[PDB]
């Protein structure tokens, strides 16, 4: 039961009418707790998890100011980046960054992250040591030199060991029922005759939390890695997740196939067959 | 570095004809973030479509969930129609009760 | 809710 507070930030230099110049969504593990954005310089904030109703008004008023200041700073940085990469005005460009901290069961800090991308590609990453940076090119190497000359990671560590920990601790307490849980998958195999006369076996997993899961089909003396159709894990919209993996198999050979489900809420993997 | 959306249409709960449910359209793996998403019942746009906030994954691509209330039957068809700047034309994905 | 100037 390790836990993370994560924020996913996006700044857009020339967004469409009505679209955000700046947006960030905050999560604890796989549960979203808020939306912040700035549209035409107007900041807005919305709660997204029930425990956020326990926050004092001062939380939202400090947050509003953070949104305004972050949105302007990100816009300024998009302007500088356009210049250093000698790109054209009039085009829209994207600056993204992820901020997180992670604690263990005893609430001990285990790690933290700060990483940024420009136009969908890695730009700069803070290393595991929380003191040095990794760049990808000569523009981001300038950034690294600035941040290291300035000691800027000191102020990021002060954020990690200050407000990131504060909020992670408070949210895990106020949202304990939602957050300190693992819901195991409920799984079954569905059976679908095909026109050609063979069969689809679709192994389903529903109702699980958190999202991380593995579904695997195995025959017996055969590996089915390249035969499986696997959908990307997907939200049910009620806080749980679902997934399936399918294989096409000969009619009358269904009992040779086994679906295995691995999830942190299970004590041992489920092994499932088409029961019939 | 544009990335094309992947689209999945599915129900929140296993479908049973005549029983209220929620229809999901989950759109992932796209960049840049501007996206247009509609849902349609028997060829008619559904106005009451809710959108989650957009977020993004480890590889920086965006994702978003569109959802609406629905009661599946034997004779109604549902679609999700998506347009992104990586696409010359919109793509429609229909709901399949088996997927 | 933190931001570093990259340039
Ligand atoms: C931008 O243009 C200058 C002018 O020639 C050049 O020195 C610099 O390398 C360019 N930046 C990139 C990222 O190519
Ligand atoms: Na549970």
Structure-token pair, residue A157? 């560590």
C2 contact residues in A (CB cutoff 8 A) = 99, 114, 156, 159
Q: Which atom of ligand 1 is nearest to the CA of A85?
A: 13
Q: How far apart are the first and last CA of chain A?
A: 38
Do the beta carbons of residue B6 and residue B84 sit within 8 Å? no
In chain C, which residues have their Cβ closer than 8 Å to the Cβ of A154? none
Residue indicated by tokens 């499932």? A272
Structure's resolution in angstroms = 1.6
A91 burial via Cβ count (<10 Å: 0-12, 13-18, 19+)? exposed
The CA distance from A128 to A143, in Å, is: 18
Q: Please indicate the experimental technique that yielded this structure.
A: X-ray
Query: Measured between alpha carbons, how far is A155 from A171 in angstroms, rounded to an integer?
Result: 23
Partner B contacted by A8 (CB < 8 A): yes
Q: What residue segments make up the domains of chain B, in order of their start?
A: 1-99
Residue A117 CB less than 6 A away from ligand 1: no
CB neighbour class for B24 (10 Å; exposed up to 12, middle 13-18, buried from 19): buried
Count of beta carbons in the 10 Å neighbourhood of residue A30: 16
> What is the Cα–Cα distance from A229 to A263, expressed in whole angstroms?
19
Specify burial of residue A213 (Cβ count, 10 A radius: 0-12, 13-18, 19+).
Answer: buried
Distance of alpha carbon A129 from alpha carbon A55, whole angstroms? 32
CB neighbour list of residue A65: distance below 8 Å, 6 or more residues apart:
none
A184 CA distance to ligand 2 centroid (A)? 7
- How far is CA A6 from each of CA A27, A101, A230, A264, B85, rounded to the nearest angstrom? 5, 7, 27, 20, 28
Residue A136 is given by DSSP the state S
Residue B52's CB is within 10 A of a number of other CB atoms, namely 18
Q: Of A135, A126, A133, A136, which Cα lies nearest the Cα of A159?
A: A126
Ligand number nearest CA of A139 is 1
Residues 6+ apart with CB under 8 A from A186: A205, A206, A207, A208
> Does residue A34 belong to the interface with chain C, where contact is any CB pair within 8 Å?
no
Shortest alpha-carbon distance between residue A143 and chain C (Å): 5
Q: Which residues contact A230 (CB under 8 A, 6 or more apart)?
A: A215, A243, A244, A245
CA distance C1 to chain A (A): 7
| Per-position b or e across A44-54, b if 16+ CB within 10 A of its CB | ebeeebebbee
Helix (H) or strand (E) holding A133: strand A133-135
- For the Cβ of A85 lying below 6 angstroms from any atom of ligand 1, the answer is yes
Write the CA distances from A155 to A127, B69, C2, C4, integer angstroms: 15, 46, 10, 9
**Exposure string (b/e) for B57-68, b if CB count within 10 Å is 16 or more?**
eeebbbbbbbbb
Beta bridge partners of A98: A8, A115
Closest partner residue to B60 (CB to CB) among A19, A117, A232 is A117
The closest alpha carbon to A131, from A118, A144, A117, belongs to A144
* Chains in touch with B (≥3 Cβ pairs < 8 A): A
Contacts with B94 (C-beta within 8 Å, 6 or more apart), sequence order: B9, B77, B78, B79
- Report whether residue A139 contacts ligand 1, using a CB cutoff of 6 Å: yes
The residues placing their C-beta within 5 Å of ligand 2, an ion, are A 181, 183
Distance CA A36, CA A46 (A): 7
| Residue B36 backbone phi and psi in degrees, to 5 | -125, 125
Sign, CA dihedral A37-A41-A43-A44, equals negative
The residue whose CA is least distant from atom 9 of ligand 1 is A85
The answer to whether the CB of B46 falls within 8 A of the CB of B37 is no
Contacts of B13 (CB under 8 A, 6+ apart): A236, B21, B22
Query: What share of residues in chain A are helix, strand, coil (percent, to 5)?
Result: 25, 40, 35
Nearest CA in chain A to C5: A77
> Ramachandran region of residue A130, left (φ > 0), alpha (ψ -120 to 50) or beta?
left
Kind and range of the H or E run holding A87? none
Residue whose entry in the numeric block shows the structure tokens 């806080």? A239
* Residue bearing tokens 């009451």: B48
Alpha-carbon distance A185 to A268, whole Å?
Answer: 12
B73 in Cβ contact with B18 (< 8 Å): yes
Neighbouring subunits of A (3+ Cβ pairs under 8 A): B, C
For A233-247, the DSSP string reads: PEE-SSS-EEEEEEE
Please name which of A207, A216, A206 lies closest in space to residue A245, comparing C-alpha atoms: A216
Confirm if A211 and A233 have CB atoms less than 8 A apart. yes
Burial class (CB in 10 A: 0-12, 13-18, 19+), A21: buried
Q: Which atom of ligand 1 is nearest to the CA of A86?
A: 1
Q: Token pair 């949104």 is at which residue?
A: A67
Residues 6 or more apart whose CB falls under 8 angstroms from that of A139 comprise A81, A84, A85, C7
Query: Ligand 2 centre from A183 Cα, in Å?
Result: 4
Q: Which residue of B has its CA nearest to A47?
A: B53
Ramachandran quadrant class, B59 (left: phi over 0; alpha: psi -120 to 50; beta: rest): alpha
From residue A9, how far is each of A22, A103, A117, B68, B99 by CA, in Å?
A: 7, 21, 10, 27, 33
Nearest atom, ligand 1, residue A137 CA: 13
User: Tokens 């931001």, residue?
Assistant: C3
């Amino acid at each position: 039961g390790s836990h993370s507070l994560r924020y996913f930030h996006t700044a857009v230099s020339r967004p469409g009418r009505g679209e955000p110049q700046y947006i960030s969504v905050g999560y604890v593990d796989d549960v979203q707790f808020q939306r912040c954005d700035s549209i035409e310089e107007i900041p807005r904030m919305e709660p997204r998890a029930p425990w956020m109703e326990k926050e004092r008004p001062e939380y939202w008023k400090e947050l509003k100011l953070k949104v305004k200041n972050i949105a302007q700073s990100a816009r300024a940085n998009l302007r500088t980046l356009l210049r250093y990469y000698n790109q054209s005005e009039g085009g829209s460009h994207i600056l993204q960054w992820m901020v997180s901290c992670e604690v263990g069961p005893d609430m001990r800090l285990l790690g933290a992250h700060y990483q940024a991308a420009y136009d969908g590609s890695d730009y700069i990453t803070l290393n595991e040591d929380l003191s040095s940076w990794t760049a990808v090119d000569m523009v981001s190497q300038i950034t690294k030199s600035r941040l290291e000359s300035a000691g800027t990671a000191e102020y990021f560590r002060a954020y990690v060991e200050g407000e990131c920990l504060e909020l992670l601790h408070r949210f895990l307490r106020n949202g304990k029922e939602i957050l300190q849980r693992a819901d195991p998958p409920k799984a079954h195999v569905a059976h679908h005759p095909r026109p050609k006369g063979d069969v689809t076996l679709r192994c389903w997993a529903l109702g699980f939390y958190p999202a991380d899961i593995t579904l695997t089909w195995q025959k017996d003396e055969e590996d089915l890695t390249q035969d499986m159709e696997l959908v990307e894990t997907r939200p049910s919209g009620d806080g749980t997740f679902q997934k399936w993996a399918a294989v096409v198999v000969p009619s009358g050979e269904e009992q040779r196939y086994t679906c295995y489900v691995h999830h942190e809420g299970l004590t041992e993997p489920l092994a499932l067959k088409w029961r019939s | 570095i544009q990335k094309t959306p992947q689209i999945q249409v599915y129900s929140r709960h296993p479908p049973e004809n005549g029983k209220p449910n929620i229809l999901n359209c989950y759109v992932t793996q796209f960049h840049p973030p501007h996206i247009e998403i509609q849902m349609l019942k028997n060829g008619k746009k559904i106005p009451k479509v809710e959108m989650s906030d957009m977020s993004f994954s480890k590889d920086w691509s965006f994702y978003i969930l569109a959802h609406t209330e629905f009661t599946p039957t034997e004779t109604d068809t549902y679609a999700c129609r998506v347009k992104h700047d990586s696409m010359a034309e919109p793509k429609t994905v229909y709901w399949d009760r088996d997927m | 809710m933190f931001f570093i100037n990259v340039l």
